[PDB]
Amino acid sequence: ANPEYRHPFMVEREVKRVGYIVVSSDRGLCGGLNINLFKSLVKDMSGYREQGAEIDL
Amino acid sequence: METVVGLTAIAVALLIGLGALGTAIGFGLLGGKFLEGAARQPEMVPMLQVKMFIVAGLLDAVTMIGVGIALFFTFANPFVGQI
């Protein structure tokens, strides 16, 4: 309804720095919950490390 | 006869002057809304500009009937014949 304004969150800047919010448990006794999550995090983070981009966590 | 000629000069000034006053205030109102609309969305400017000229034909209608009659009182004169 208001095309005159576009908040910085609704427009993409194609530059080399990214951020991640990582959710994990406090307690143990989990059947691979954190392990499979960190494996997926490392898999996607490496794409940015290899593309020369910096990462914040 | 000098009253008819002198009062025709005032009639001409009132007839052109009240049209110069109305057209400048009336289009400054419309024009401001056109610039505001252009700022809200520059994609619709060609369409909005055409809509502004469509209203400009209604706004300047009667002001030209007075500019035509006033220029018809300065060169020709329908009141001198009437004595």
Swiss-Prot record, chain A:
- Signal sequence: where? none
Q: Where in the cell is it found?
A: Cell inner membrane
Describe the function of this protein. Answer: Produces ATP from ADP in the presence of a proton gradient across the membrane. The gamma chain is believed to be important in regulating ATPase activity and the flow of protons through the CF(0) complex.
Q: Which family does it belong to?
A: Belongs to the ATPase gamma chain family.
Its subunit composition reads:
F-type ATPases have 2 components, CF(1) - the catalytic core - and CF(0) - the membrane proton channel. CF(1) has five subunits: alpha(3), beta(3), gamma(1), delta(1), epsilon(1). CF(0) has three main subunits: a, b and c.
**Could you tell me what this protein is called?**
ATP synthase gamma chain
Recorded source organism is Pseudomonas paraeruginosa (strain DSM 24068 / PA7) (Pseudomonas aeruginosa (strain PA7))
Organism lineage reads as: Bacteria, Pseudomonadati, Pseudomonadota, Gammaproteobacteria, Pseudomonadales
Complete-protein stretch covered: 59 to 115 of 286
UniProtKB/Swiss-Prot annotation, chain B:
UniProt KW Ion transport keyword: yes
Keyword Ribonucleoprotein (UniProt): no
A Pfam family that this protein carries is: ATP-synt_C
Source superkingdom: Bacteria
- Write out the entry's keywords from A to Z: ATP synthesis, Cell inner membrane, Cell membrane, CF(0), Hydrogen ion transport, Ion transport, Lipid-binding, Membrane, Transmembrane, Transmembrane helix, Transport
Signal peptide range equals none
Chain segments annotated as transmembrane: 10-30, 53-73
GO CC: one term?
A: proton-transporting ATP synthase complex
Instruction: Give one GO term, molecular function aspect.
Output: proton-transporting ATP synthase activity, rotational mechanism
Q: Where in the cell is it found?
A: Cell inner membrane
Q: What is the topology of this protein in the membrane according to its UniProt annotation?
A: Multi-pass membrane protein
Q: Where is this site: Reversibly protonated during proton transport?
A: 60
Its subunit composition reads: F-type ATPases have 2 components, F(1) - the catalytic core - and F(0) - the membrane proton channel. F(1) has five subunits: alpha(3), beta(3), gamma(1), delta(1), epsilon(1). F(0) has three main subunits: a(1), b(2) and c(10-14). The alpha and beta chains form an alternating ring which encloses part of the gamma chain. F(1) is attached to F(0) by a central stalk formed by the gamma and epsilon chains, while a peripheral stalk is formed by the delta and b chains.
Matching entries from NCBIfam families are given as: ATP_synt_c (TIGR01260), PRK06876.1 (NF005363)
Family the entry assigns: Belongs to the ATPase C chain family.
Function description? F(1)F(0) ATP synthase produces ATP from ADP in the presence of a proton or sodium gradient. F-type ATPases consist of two structural domains, F(1) containing the extramembraneous catalytic core and F(0) containing the membrane proton channel, linked together by a central stalk and a peripheral stalk. During catalysis, ATP synthesis in the catalytic domain of F(1) is coupled via a rotary mechanism of the central stalk subunits to proton translocation. Key component of the F(0) channel; it plays a direct role in translocation across the membrane. A homomeric c-ring of between 10-14 subunits forms the central stalk rotor element with the F(1) delta and epsilon subunits.
Q: What is this protein called?
A: ATP synthase subunit c
Source organism phylogeny: Bacteria, Pseudomonadati, Pseudomonadota, Gammaproteobacteria, Pseudomonadales
